[PDB]
Amino acid sequence: EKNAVRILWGRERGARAMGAQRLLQELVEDKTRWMKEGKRVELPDSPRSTFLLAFSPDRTLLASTHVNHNIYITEVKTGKCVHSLIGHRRTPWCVTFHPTISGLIASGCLDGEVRIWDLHGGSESWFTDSNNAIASLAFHPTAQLLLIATANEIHFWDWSRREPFAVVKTASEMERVRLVRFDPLGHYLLTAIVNPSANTTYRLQWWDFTKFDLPEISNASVNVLVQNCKIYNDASCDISADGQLLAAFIPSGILAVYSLAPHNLGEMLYTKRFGPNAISVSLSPMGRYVMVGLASHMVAQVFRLQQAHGGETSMRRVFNVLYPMHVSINSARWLPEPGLGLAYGTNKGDLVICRP
Amino acid sequence: MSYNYVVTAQKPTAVNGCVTGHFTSAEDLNLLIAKNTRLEIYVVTAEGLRPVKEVGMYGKIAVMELFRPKGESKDLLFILTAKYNACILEYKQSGESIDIITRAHGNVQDRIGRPSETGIIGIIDPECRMIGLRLYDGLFKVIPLDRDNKELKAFNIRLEELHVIDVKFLYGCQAPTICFVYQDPQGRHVKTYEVSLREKNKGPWKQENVEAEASMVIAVPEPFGGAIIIESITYHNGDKYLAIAPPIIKQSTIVCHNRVDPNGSRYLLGDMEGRLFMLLLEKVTLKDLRVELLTSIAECLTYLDNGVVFVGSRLGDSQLVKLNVDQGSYVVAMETFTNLGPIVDMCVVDLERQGQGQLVTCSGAFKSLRIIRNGIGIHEHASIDLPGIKGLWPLRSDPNRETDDTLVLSFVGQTRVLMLNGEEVEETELMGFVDDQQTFFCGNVAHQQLIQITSASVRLVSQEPKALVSEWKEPQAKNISVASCNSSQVVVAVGRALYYLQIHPQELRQISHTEMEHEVACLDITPLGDSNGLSPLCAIGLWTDISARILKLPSFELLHKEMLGGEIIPRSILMTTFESSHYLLCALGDGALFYFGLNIETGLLSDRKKVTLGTQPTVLRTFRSLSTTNVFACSDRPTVIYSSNHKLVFSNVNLKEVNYMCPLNSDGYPDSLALANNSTLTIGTIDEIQKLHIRTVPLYESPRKICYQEVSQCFGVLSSRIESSSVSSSKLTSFGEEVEVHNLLIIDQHTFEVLHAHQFLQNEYALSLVSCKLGKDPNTYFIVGTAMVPKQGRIVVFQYSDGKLQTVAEKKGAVYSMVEFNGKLLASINSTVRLYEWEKELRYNNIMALYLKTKGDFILVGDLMRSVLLLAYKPMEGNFEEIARDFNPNWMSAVEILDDDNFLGAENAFNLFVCQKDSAATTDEERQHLQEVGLFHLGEFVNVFCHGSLVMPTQGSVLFGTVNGMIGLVTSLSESWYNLLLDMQNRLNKVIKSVGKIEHSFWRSFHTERKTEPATGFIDGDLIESFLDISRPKMQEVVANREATADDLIKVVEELTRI
């Protein structure tokens, strides 16, 4: 029965026929696709733009970067701006929360400065040797580590020490390291590197960091999963909470879903065609619905996976999410728990949390 | 200003794990039941199951398996708390005091893991070289079992099979070998790996394909080698292949499995339909497989020994079946536990229209009503169909050798003496009294003599001579109205005059004679202290003035008196000592009971309180159930006057009507007590005053709700089966669909026999039932909601009649829930609230509901979508208004309202939170947010909330049933008492931290996987109730640093245990 009751009757009756909780959250996502608001939040200052939302793993707070060279921290429930991280002389480019240690957040700016912040008190800062622009950041969930990529150099630094330990560089200077990210399990590492020559093409290499071996990313033909992918920021690709799903742009922007399970790793499950305005993607916690922010009302869209064959009809359009006002979506992401809603940032300098 | 108090009355009883081992000792096999939050340690014997230590550990058990490490004398136990608080437990066996010493502890929780779909399981290497826990998908956490690593420093190993159904370790291999079936999207497969410690591989056989409906794994032991995957039971070991496809198995699925013998020639498989299968194997390489058919539903089977199989049921009453080798079936039940499991709902009913209430539950499912009360129950032994008796008192017709062998029954004008030569009840009169005269006392005093105090004359008959020795009568030819004689003195009252007689050797001698202002109503002389039969004081009552006075027995001189209102004469008065302070009981003829303290030296007028009782006259009597004697009240509402620390309780009794009572100590009835009524004779023992008694009545169906009927005196229960009477006539489909057959069983409240069954349509899930008085019609209804899943919905107004159910009206989609508000039904479902009313018919915001509850007030609490919603009904507007909606969404399970401010609540993560309108600003811009003024983690799946209480400084109460069968109470209280007690709330941490070295605040935290916040104002009642269990030498140093008295707080807290 497609009811909350019978599934729950089996649950409350102590019959541990698991998978029901999965199905129940499948239903509420289906249920929440029908319900309809735009709630704003005040800010201590008036930044021109809002960039790079990043949700907490404990959902206690929410960091965000703004052009005012400050980072605002807001609580999701109250919607009240509590903390405003200040200290970057330049606008930060990458902000990532810490899965294990609560309140320890890092942020790196275009001037080559990284700043590890703590809400309770204290902070650390390190300087790149040639103050180059920072590309992407990726915290290590289990191991005490944060990887730093600036142009083509991967910096292996432990914040318990002042200076990075290991230095690994690509085959060429122009072979830039654009994006780095661990998976929600910390077993595999995805490295985005520009292809040798806008039509700037990038490739994804799939390094196993289980043994913490330094990835020899100079080779462009080892552990490659995607030959060509369009990447502009760190939010253009993301991994589902379960870790068995992945979304990434491909050129003719075509969003395609690739199974991360080893049995059919790299196999293309679901696909749809999108215009150039597609920027960032985000997967629902149970790997069924995808949120995508769009550039210029219809600013966002949600889809649902029905059958995996690689064709266009893999998903079906569900509905649209609007904002109570050109406006182009910079960042968006599904809230950690399914069905709560979504938060996003605005190029005009707005942070709005939408709920049904 | 609003601070709660959570306490549990009945602990959970659903079974979750039955792993067997040698935890208690190497030479004593145990069974290790694991309830939701407490593990019961039993020892299995020939008789059955015997609890040895019922340790309630502060955690929710999820993974639990006994293993034997190398160099360990006894097998350890690995409890994995549902919050990943992994601990290697070890039973500490020292002496009378037994605790659970933690060998190693540590939160193995993973900040990035996601629990696997098919639950959480853990396995141990056969050679104890490794511990393997399957917490997250594709994350096989491995804990080495070296003598080091007391902090349980675990590490993660990736698995290729992301989705794993069941995993075990194959026997008979050098390296750690693992066998498991996964669900890659090509049927179902099996794989093998060699787990490497240092490296952190390949197995004996490669990956093959098996049936897509095979999920369970049975790894055979060393002599055979290999694994059995479970209408297809295969076997796999290297290249050898076997498979069978029996037709019987195709009917349903199999859920239980475990090895039977070390040889591997027999196995157990449990079906979902209560069928006990029996797997066989023929003997190296085997030849072929075979299946056999030989019970209630089983959740985890555990073959104990010699054909004893424990059928652990999370769906119903867990059984203890026997498998006999010799209808020709081999499934016979020996034991059936009273485990209330899926408590789907309940309601509070006062069947006898007395102060106490009752609970009727709907336990079990598929293949349901049980009665929950709070009074002390009595198990009847012998029944005699005798007429009304004017009194009851045991008689010792034998010499001073303890016990008794004779019973004295007093009629209206006759006295029938009964002899009990064991279990027989024969009326035999002794030649020492008069059988044609009413006797007020037929007991024994001393000198082997039985005092026969009758209305005509007091008689004293020796037990040995079996004849009257002396007879004392008033020298006025007047009938004796009130008499009293305990062990050595007689205080009888005739008219307005009273005479005192001494129980001398074979002679009666008058000692005092005095007259009172009014006629004496009752006389009671009993030692309340250091007195061996000779009562110093003597109580006397008045009818014209209705007053109670205390006088010295030897001289009949009044000492003090207390005035009383009204004109009802006191039915009975008694004074006795049951605690450090003696108490005096005064009972009126209408049933009013006055309890006041008494002093053995002076007898000053202490504090007096009015305690309600039955409408019939009450005769006070003491009972010996435990070491501390209690008093019992016989009236239309019988009650037992027990105590907890220093105050007298008034717990009810399990009987219809009581006219007289008398203790019994005969050889055939050691702890029985005589009971009298209009025409009845029952016996009972009673041990406590807090046990809950359960009466069962199976229905073999799946119920949804229940409501009581006050004018027809019969319950109603929904039925939904899968395959007097009535059939629906709804005049307003593939072969294989989802259709259920529904009924409505009307259970009589007297005979517990169903009287009707209203069969409904096919493919229509009706799961609602409400009893109310809709509109101005005096007729009382059985309103039942019917839902099909949804473009239609109808409601049958089951207007009950003499023998036939009727319908008044029928009235777009499936309605969700509604109970009567005041006299109407205006439901809130399908994203549209209603304004309905009762022509005998039942004749917009996007408001849809899942659970709904309200007190008699206009205040209403509901839920739109995963949020506690508070709604107010404005009579001027006649609709619903959203007052304050709780944010921070939680997956709610049951909702209740404590008072106008505090809103109790629960959610599926086993947590309780209370909302309250704390003062705020901005007129109405943040008041719509209900700031959580409390956070508490209970550990149970609260299912139904209901008001009422099982007893007659909070104002209100609440009960909640769980999915595991736990009942409890929640109160509220101001900040003044809370804040003062807040400082000493954590005082108990020092004397004891936890059972598995767990932080106190960690249980005070909000254990949801996202948040963690210490309890805010939720005062526990479980920990404080354990304050009285702390030993006296240990109780001294706690709360020791205004008078700072040792027992000052105990009195302040002993009032909490009476809630």
Residue numbers in the entry:
A (entry chain B): 6 to 41, 43 to 203, 856 to 910, 919 to 962, 973 to 1001, 1008 to 1038
B (entry chain A): 1 to 200, 203 to 232, 235 to 287, 295 to 305, 308 to 339, 343 to 383, 386 to 741, 762 to 770, ...
What text appears in the publication on this structure?
AMBRA1 is a tumor suppressor protein that functions as a substrate receptor of the ubiquitin conjugation system with roles in autophagy and the cell cycle regulatory network. Damage-specific DNA binding protein 1 (DDB1) is a component of the Cullin4A/B-RING E3 ubiquitin ligase (CRL4) complex and functions as an adaptor protein between Cullin4A/B (CUL4A/B) and CUL4A-associated factors (DCAFs) to target substrates for ubiquitination. AMBRA1 limits CDK4/6 activity by mediating ubiquitination and degradation of Cyclin D1 as part of the CRL4DDB1 E3 ligase complex. DDB1 has three seven-bladed WD40 β-propellers (referred to as BPA, BPB and BPC) and a C-terminal helical domain (CTD).
